[PDB]
């Protein structure tokens, strides 16, 4: 283990000593764009370093090639680097062409110091042993997993390091096998970066309501994919909310009151900024629970809305303008007629932020708006770079959306979220009508060849959102076994497909013995092994390893080779 | 056998739970400590005033601590019943520790004090267990039941009260290697609130439930002068606390009078004073406006109040029946008394404690100059009454001889030629003094 | 030209803010710069006196220039103390005084509007009073003073004018209009009095 | 003067020569005696010292007074307003 | 009813005087600017009122025809307070509303929605000339010459001259309109398709 | 009108700015080899304000 939770403050003080020189800017923050949790963590760190007046550089990175190019362009004066949301699984010193000897200064005296110290922060569990153990430049902020579950891995790695007859070779083989079985494991995430930096801040003691709100947003960002982690971390955020809230409850609403509350936050889509009927119609959970893509789904939706006794016009009215009667009896109405249709899990308790008279807002709606701003905020290797430029630019739009003075941007993000949900819903219903998903014994392939708004899915987050829709829909199909799906989208301008390796997940609210065991996305090593051989001009640069760009001509041979591959 | 027999836990400048999960434990000069329920247990927050040397921290607690004490190098927490104590140094280099107090039947921890040499715990029974920084015990003692404690860098102060003996103070300097004692069980003049506790109070029943004897805080001064404050709303100072024979309990402030005379004439009650520390006329105190005496978490700015002996007479201050008008005649004498007492206190620490900030000698000289300025004003006031003997008596206490020349000029100017010769005689005597 | 047209004869609100930034105010230092009897760099400035800054003691009110206090308030390393006129009682008394005398302005400090705006923006949590009420009362005073100004405008003579007790920001915002109308009225009279 | 030296076809030859010499005169005034202060600097008061900025036009790497600035496009700095005034005037950094 | 009317009027006056998003009292400033240009009106946004207090919005939406005149009276009182130094003859202000509710189709208007608030769209096809509706009506008793005044809300419930003398009998219709002293406002009839 | 130039005052301010900038540079060079940079930032912003004042004065003249 490198940096435990209890010793994060030591790293903070070391960084402060290294680069609290206002004459220059010797600290640079690298953040993976198209990642909400990384954005929230970077906002926390930016506010914190604004407090101590430490000049910092914030660079949003989309692909690994961009990271290496920037590091090559990176000046030598910068003695402190921060990686947010990436770098914890790959050989950075090999990736960035780094040896300890070039960066080491004042080597003497059992100690070592370096002219450039890089601190990574991501929660992907395949912690690179050469990066967590066999280096001093790379500094990782462990969340208690390496120090507790990688003891055998630590011993094997140190045995290999110290050893560079027959029984000696046998033990070397055993240690290497242990290391390898530790590897070849799907990339999974156990904690949220926002919670880790919030714990660090609490250790420093510079917390406030805004930082707690940022931590709530960052944790909520992982609810859709990693709901078990969200349930694990929910009590800590709840206790922090109870602690920080002033005792002057039920106070008269002033234009300056900023209140965080814990209240029923039902698992709908943009409830407070859309009609109840549309919230149900666009909720991924409800859609998966009744398979609304069929014509029977809309009829059954009307069936519920009739069964509760709510007029359809009232349900289709905007949330703010509904009658106060329904707006004050929604909870009881859900209590009466939710278990009937199996949608009892919709009822949930979450955190709601109210800023004076500006109206309330829930964390789920805010993170949906942020993701929408990330996605659609605005010969072959040139237009792709322009797409990277636009994707990175949308990161700053999503970042500035955090400011309470830019609520107009938040409204645009909400509209974009509604439109993106509509587009993903329509694409899913069209796919499930035409049955573009071809079931195999390895993975359920699905490639979009032509159709509407296909240019929207070249954005990685849009493809992930479509994957969330389809995986949620297929999760409620008990007949359909657990199996990953693969999505591709041809970019006509570049004549390339965007293959997105996905992973199955357990249905939300379905908690079992196997549910506690996470699903591991083994598309990483399969993709890399297939690409290393049989050169097909594949572009694997995303920090999310299960996303590649493939030539249109090479798409079919690549998929055939992947079927021949049993790695995943 | 009830009420005051409940030696309920008390901390310097405490606070009741009131109507919330929240509660302030201690409000020292170096910060404050607060508690809150996370719907099942207390999470304790410690914040400091000297932002730049210490850092706020809030920590999980399942025991539900009930007492606190803060210092420059570490803070101590304690429990009322089964009173496990926990001492945590602010710096991470020194490891925090916890231990269990030896608790007996009817025993309840009253107050705890921590000193960079030893840590001492108060007891409802009256025990005086003495420990070290790290928890290893040193000695256990028993005296009259301690109910409050205070610790300077190396000196500590205690008040022993029992239903048999009354309020007796004891001030002793533990020291690095010299356990020098300065007082032991000597009585003290603080008035205890009993009439107001006879079921006639508005929302003060809850506070009296928190603190039966209504003692607010026992902070020291910037130079080590013990100070007392309670429901009587009057500070008490130990002028010559250095000499055991020279005990002097002097009233230095009267909160009700100051509040009334700064309120414009209204005898308002909703203004309550929570003192934190006194430092050379700088008495920091929250002036809460409302029915709740104890402060809140949007903590009111610690507005500073100056010292004023209760020489202000309501009959005299009612000259203008209703910016409250101040009659200058005794106000100047009040300033004279302030300068005299502050000169005594500063001189006490000048030879013993030495210089603290590099300006003590200059402020002492300025204070003496103001002392003789007030003396000259009173001399002129006496000459206004054509009381040559009164002016003669006032002239003896002048310190600066420039003020003596001014006294000569006043005598020759305030229609008192007979005073001129005697002031000149005093000046000639001073020439040889 | 060297001076832009909009800065020819009036001050921009940023200039008024900068000018007001040099007023001394009393603050509570959250640090203690008093170097004990038992290194560090002093402020040793030239636009103001460094003596108080080098001798700050934690939670001991001192007086420093306003913009240094704001710079410290960028962190939690200080705390601003509202002046005595920033209390609800004094604002109410000024409101009553204004409503009582329709022809004369209140005796507020000349920099009250800009000071209120700066403190509300950057020191919103250093007031014993509810800020939502202070903002409303400040706005009410501004409206009442505007109403008084408009009625005092109906007596724009050609010789002189007396704007007694008027604040600084209002004067700055009314300068280009009044100083130009007055010039034209003077010019007309002088042309008439050409004999 | 600190922004750009530029379509001159709209001006007569006398006006063009006047501008060319007037730039020289302005520079001479800036470097004559009042060189410690920047006479061409911003006329807005320096309300704040440290600000955040975003790179509009990528300029690669530019050496500042003490360290160096890597003006990566779509990247945000948080540095002193004093040493970035000229770059913002030229049109490289946008945020305030 | 007078107590409830005063309660609602005071609540709306507080809403006007206090509502603000960020350091700017939007409605106060808008009212002041409208008074400055002799525009005795105010455009009130619905989401603002809803966010201020849902109870006020519910009471408004229940019986708008009775709530709105009280709001106009409160607006007039606020205008007098913050546009004229105390110690008149200011016309009652006209309220203007802006909302984002779902636009009900024109043919969907039915037996319900009566006396409610409705948002819809259309195309104007006819604009009649401006007629005059009285707001202040000076009136004269016919026989005993007892002159009084009447204030008309112009919000028809679902008003006529009083049917008694009100201080000899003077007849059941003892009142005549005093045209030269009454006050009138313009009203236009539009036809939507 | 153009008011008379205060030659002595401007000379004293120019000398003060020269020596202050030299002192700031010396402090920075010494620091370039505690971490209480607050006074250094104060000198920087104070010198900036003074320079802005003199710049505005000269350009108005
Ligand atoms: Zn009649």
UniProtKB/Swiss-Prot annotation, chain A:
Assembles into a complex with MCM5/CDC46. Interacts with MCM10. GO terms for molecular function: chromatin binding; DNA replication origin binding; single-stranded DNA binding. Keywords: Cell cycle, DNA replication, Nucleus, Phosphoprotein. This is Cell division control protein 45. Belongs to the CDC45 family. It holds the Pfam family CDC45. Required for initiation of chromosomal DNA replication. Acts at the origin of replication. Also has a role in minichromosome maintenance. GO terms for cellular component: CMG complex; DNA replication preinitiation complex; nuclear replication fork; nucleus. Present with 1730 molecules/cell in log phase SD medium. Its main location: nucleus. It is found in: Nucleus. The keyword Zinc does not apply. One of its GO terms (biological process) is DNA replication initiation. InterPro entries: CDC45. Transmembrane segments: none annotated. PANTHER family: CDC45-RELATED PROTEIN, CELL DIVISION CONTROL PROTEIN 45 HOMOLOG.
From Swiss-Prot, chain B:
It comes from the Eukaryota. It is found in: Nucleus. WD repeats lie at residues 230-270. Transmembrane segments: none annotated. Accessory factor for DNA replication. It plays a role in accurately duplicating the genome in vivo. Present with 3280 molecules/cell in log phase SD medium. This is DNA polymerase alpha-binding protein. It comes from Saccharomyces cerevisiae (strain ATCC 204508 / S288c) (Baker's yeast). The gene is CTF4.
Swiss-Prot record, chain C:
InterPro entries: GINS_A, GINS_bundle-like_dom_sf, GINS_Psf2, PSF2_N. Component of the GINS complex which is a heterotetramer of SLD5, PSF1, PSF2 and PSF3. Interacts with PSF1 and SLD5. The keyword Flavoprotein does not apply. The keyword Membrane does not apply. Belongs to the GINS2/PSF2 family. Keywords: DNA replication, Nucleus. Gene3D superfamilies: 1.20.58.1020, 3.40.5.50. Pfam families: PSF2_N, Sld5. SUPFAM superfamilies: GINS helical bundle-like, PriA/YqbF domain. PANTHER family: DNA REPLICATION COMPLEX GINS PROTEIN PSF2 (PTHR12772:SF0). The gene is PSF2. It comes from Saccharomyces cerevisiae (strain ATCC 204508 / S288c) (Baker's yeast). GO terms for biological process: DNA-templated DNA replication; double-strand break repair via break-induced replication. GO terms for cellular component: CMG complex; DNA replication preinitiation complex; GINS complex; nuclear replication fork; nucleus. This is DNA replication complex GINS protein PSF2. Its main location: nucleus. It comes from the Eukaryota. Functions as part of the GINS complex which plays an essential role in the initiation of DNA replication by binding to DNA replication origins and facilitating the assembly of the DNA replication machinery. It is found in: Nucleus.
Swiss-Prot record, chain D:
Present with 1431 molecules/cell in log phase SD medium. Disulfide bonds: none annotated. It comes from Saccharomyces cerevisiae (strain ATCC 204508 / S288c) (Baker's yeast). Component of the GINS complex which is a heterotetramer of SLD5, PSF1, PSF2 and PSF3. Interacts with PSF2. Belongs to the GINS1/PSF1 family. It comes from the Eukaryota. Required for DNA replication. Functions as part of the GINS complex which plays an essential role in the initiation of DNA replication by binding to DNA replication origins and facilitating the assembly of the DNA replication machinery. Required for the chromatin binding of CDC45. The chain holds residues 105 to 208 of 208 of the full protein. This is DNA replication complex GINS protein PSF1. It is found in: Nucleus. The gene is PSF1.
């Amino acid at each position: 283990m490198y940096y435990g939770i209890s010793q994060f403050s030591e790293a903070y003080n070391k960084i402060l000593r290294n680069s609290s020189s206002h004459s220059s800017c010797q600290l640079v923050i690298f953040v993976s764009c198209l990642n909400i949790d990384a954005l929230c963590a970077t906002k926390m760190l930016s506010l914190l370093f604004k407090k101590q007046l430490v000049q910092s550089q914030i660079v949003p990175i989309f692909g690994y090639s961009e990271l290496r190019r920037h590091y090559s362009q990176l000046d030598d004066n910068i003695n402190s680097l921060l990686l947010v949301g990436f770098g914890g699984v790959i050989d950075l010193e090999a990736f960035l062409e780094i040896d300890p000897q070039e960066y080491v200064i004042d080597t003497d005296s059992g100690e070592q110091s370096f002219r450039r110290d890089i601190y990574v922060l991501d929660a992907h569990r395949p912690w690179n042993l050469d990066n967590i153990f066999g280096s001093q430049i790379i500094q990782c902020f462990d969340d208690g997993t390496v120090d507790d579950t990688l003891g055998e891995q630590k011993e094997a790695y140190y045995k290999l390091l110290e050893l560079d007859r027959k029984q000696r070779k046998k033990q070397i083989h055993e240690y290497e096998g242990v290391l390898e079985e530790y590897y070849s494991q799907g990339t999974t995430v156990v904690n949220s970066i926002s919670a880790q930096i919030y714990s660090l801040l609490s250790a420093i003691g510079e917390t406030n309501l805004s930082n707690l709100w940022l931590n709530i947003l960052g944790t909520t960002s992982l609810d859709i994919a990693y709901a078990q982690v969200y349930n694990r971390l929910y009590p800590l955020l709840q206790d922090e909310v109870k602690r920080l809230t002033p005792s002057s409850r039920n106070s008269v609403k002033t234009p300056d009151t900023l209140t965080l509350n814990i209240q029923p936050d039902y698992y709908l889509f943009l409830l407070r900024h859309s009609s109840l009927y549309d919230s149900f119609y666009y909720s991924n959970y409800v859609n998966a629970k009744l398979s609304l893509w069929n014509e029977n789904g809309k009829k059954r939706l009307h069936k519920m809305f009739a069964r509760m006794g709510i007029p359809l016009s009232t349900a289709q009215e905007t949330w703010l303008y509904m009658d106060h009667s329904i707006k004050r009896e929604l909870g009881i109405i859900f209590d009466k007629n939710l278990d009937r249709y199996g949608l009892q899990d919709i009822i949930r308790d979450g955190f709601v932020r109210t800023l004076g008279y500006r109206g309330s807002i829930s964390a789920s709606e805010f993170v949906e708006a942020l993701t929408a701003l990330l996605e659609v905020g605005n010969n072959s290797a040139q237009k792709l770079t322009n797409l990277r430029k636009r994707w990175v630019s949308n990161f700053w739009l999503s970042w500035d959306a955090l400011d309470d003075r830019k609520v107009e941007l938040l409204n645009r993000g909400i509209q974009l979220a509604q439109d993106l949900q509509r587009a993903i819903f329509n694409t899913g219903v069209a796919i499930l009508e035409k049955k573009l998903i071809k079931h195999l014994r390895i993975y359920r392939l699905c490639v979009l060849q032509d159709g509407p708004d296909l240019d929207l899915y070249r954005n990685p987050l849009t493809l992930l959102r479509l994957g969330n829709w389809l995986i949620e829909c297929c999760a409620e199909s008990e007949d359909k076994q657990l199996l990953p799906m693969v999505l591709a989208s041809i970019d006509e301008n570049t004549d390339t497909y965007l293959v997105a390796g996905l992973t199955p997940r357990y249905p939300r609210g379905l908690d079992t013995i196997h549910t506690k065991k996470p699903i591991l996305n083994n598309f990483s090593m399969a993709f890399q092994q297939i690409t290393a051989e049989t050169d097909a001009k594949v572009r694997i640069d995303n920090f999310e390893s299960s996303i590649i760009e493939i030539r249109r001509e090479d798409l079919s041979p690549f998929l055939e080779k992947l079927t021949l591959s049993g790695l995943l | 056998n009830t009420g005051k027999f409940r030696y309920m836990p008390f901390s310097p400048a405490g606070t009741p739970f009131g109507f919330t999960d929240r509660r302030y434990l201690t409000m020292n000069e170096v910060g404050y400590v607060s508690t809150v329920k996370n719907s099942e247990q207390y999470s304790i927050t410690v914040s400091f005033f000297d932002v730049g040397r210490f850092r706020e921290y809030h920590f999980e607690d399942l025991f539900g601590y009930d007492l606190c004490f803060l210092n420059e190098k570490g803070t101590l927490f304690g429990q009322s019943k089964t009173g496990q104590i926990q001492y945590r140094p602010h710096d991470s280099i020194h490891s925090n520790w916890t231990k269990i107090i030896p608790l007996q039947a009817g025993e309840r921890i009253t107050s705890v004090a921590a000193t960079p040499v030893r840590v001492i715990v108060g007891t409802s029974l009256g025990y005086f267990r003495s420990f070290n920084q790290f928890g290893v015990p040193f000695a256990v003692e028993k005296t009259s039941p301690i109910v409050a404690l205070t610790a300077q860098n190396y000196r500590v102060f205690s008040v022993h009260y029992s239903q048999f003996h009354g309020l007796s103070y004891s001030l002793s300097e533990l020291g690095t290697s010299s356990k020098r004692y300065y007082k032991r069980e000597c009585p003290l003049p603080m008035s205890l609130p009993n009439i107001n506790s006879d079921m006639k109070k508005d929302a003060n029943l809850d506070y009296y439930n928190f603190n039966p004897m209504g003692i607010k805080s026992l902070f020291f001064s910037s130079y080590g002068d013990p100070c007392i404050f309670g429901s009587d709303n009057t500070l008490l100072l130990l002028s010559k606390w250095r000499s055991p024979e020279e005990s002097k309990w002097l009233p230095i402030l009267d909160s009700n009078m100051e509040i009334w005379k700064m309120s414009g004439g209204k005898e308002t009650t909703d203004i309550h004073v929570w003192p934190l520390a006194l430092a050379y006329d700088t008495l920091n105190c929250i002036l809460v406006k409302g029915k709740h005496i104890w402060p809140e978490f949007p903590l009111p700015l610690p507005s500073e109040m100056e010292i004023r002996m209760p020489v202000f007479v309501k009959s005299k201050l009612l000259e203008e029946n209703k910016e409250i008008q101040i009659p200058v005649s005794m106000a100047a004498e009040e300033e004279y008394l302030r300068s005299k007492v502050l000169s005594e206190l500063l001189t006490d620490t000048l030879e013993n404690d030495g210089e603290m900030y590099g300006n003590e000698n200059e402020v002492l000289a300025a204070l003496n100059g103001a002392y003789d300025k007030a003396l000259l004003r009173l001399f002129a006031s006496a000459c206004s009454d054509q009381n040559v003997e009164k002016a003669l008596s006032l002239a003896h206490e002048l310190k600066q001889d420039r003020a003596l020349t001014a006294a000569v000029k006043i005598s020759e100017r305030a229609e008192l030629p007979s005073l001129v010769k005697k002031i000149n005689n005093i000046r000639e005597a001073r020439y040889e003094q | 030209m060297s001076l832009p047209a909009h800065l020819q004869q009036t001050f921009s609100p940023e200039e008024i803010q900068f000018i007001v930034e040099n007023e001394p105010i009393k603050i509570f230092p959250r640090i203690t710069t008093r170097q004990k009897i038992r290194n560090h760099t002093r402020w040793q400035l030239i636009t103001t006196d460094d003596k108080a800054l080098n001798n700050m003691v934690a939670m001991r009110s001192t007086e420093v220039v306003l913009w240094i206090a704001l710079l410290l308030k960028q962190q939690s390393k200080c705390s601003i103390v509202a002046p005595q006129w920033l209390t609800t009682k004094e604002l109410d008394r000024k409101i009553q005084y204004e409503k009582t005398h329709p022809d004369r302005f209140s005796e507020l400090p000349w920099n009250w509007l800009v000071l209120a705006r700066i403190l509300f923006n950057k020191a919103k949590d250093d007031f014993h009073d509810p800020i939502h009420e202070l903002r409303g009362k400040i706005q009410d005073l501004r409206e009442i003073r505007q109403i008084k100004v408009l009625k005092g405008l109906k007596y724009l003579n050609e010789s002189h004018l007396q704007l007694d007790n008027l604040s600084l920001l209002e004067i700055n915002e009314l300068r280009p209009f009044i100083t130009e109308i007055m010039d034209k009225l003077r010019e007309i009279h002088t042309a008439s009095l050409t004999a | 003067n600190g922004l750009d030296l530029m379509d001159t076809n709209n001006l007569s030859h006398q006006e063009q020569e006047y501008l060319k010499e007037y730039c020289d005169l302005i520079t001479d005034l800036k470097s004559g005696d009042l060189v410690d202060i920047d006479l061409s600097g911003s006329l807005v008061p320096p309300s704040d010292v440290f600000i955040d900025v975003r790179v509009l036009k990528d300029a690669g790497e530019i050496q500042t007074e003490y360290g160096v600035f890597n003006l990566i496009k779509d990247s945000q700095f948080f540095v002193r307003q004093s040493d970035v005034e000229r770059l913002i005037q030229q049109g490289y950094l946008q945020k305030i | 009813n007078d107590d409830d009317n005063t309660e609602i009027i005071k609540s709306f006056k507080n809403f006007i005087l206090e509502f603000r998003l960020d350091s700017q009292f939007i409605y106060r400033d808008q009212l002041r600017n409208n008074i400055l240009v002799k525009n005795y009106s105010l455009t009130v946004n619905m989401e603002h009122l809803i966010g201020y207090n849902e109870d006020i919005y519910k009471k408004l939406s229940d019986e708008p025809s009775d709530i709105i005149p009280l709001f106009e009276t409160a607006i007039t009182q606020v205008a007098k307070r913050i546009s004229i130094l105390s110690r008149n003859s200011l016309p009652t202000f006209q309220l203007i509303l802006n909302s984002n509710a779902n636009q009900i189709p024109l043919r969907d208007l039915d037996s319900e929605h009566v006396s409610k608030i409705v948002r819809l769209s259309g195309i104007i096809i006819s604009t009649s000339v401006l007629s005059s509706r009285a707001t202040y009506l000076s009136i004269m008793c016919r026989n005993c010459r007892h002159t009084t005044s009447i204030t008309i809300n112009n919000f028809n419930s679902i008003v006529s001259l009083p049917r008694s003398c009100l201080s000899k009998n003077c007849g059941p219709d003892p009142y005549i309109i005093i045209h030269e002293s009454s006050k009138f406002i313009d009203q236009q009839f539009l036809k939507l398709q | 009108e153009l008011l008379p130039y205060p030659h002595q005052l401007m000379k004293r301010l120019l000398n003060r700015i020269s020596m202050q900038s030299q002192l700031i540079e010396n402090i920075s060079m010494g620091f370039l080899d505690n971490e209480s940079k607050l006074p250094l930032l104060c000198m920087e912003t104070e010198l900036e304000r003074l320079k802005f004042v003199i710049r505005s004065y000269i350009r108005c003249r």
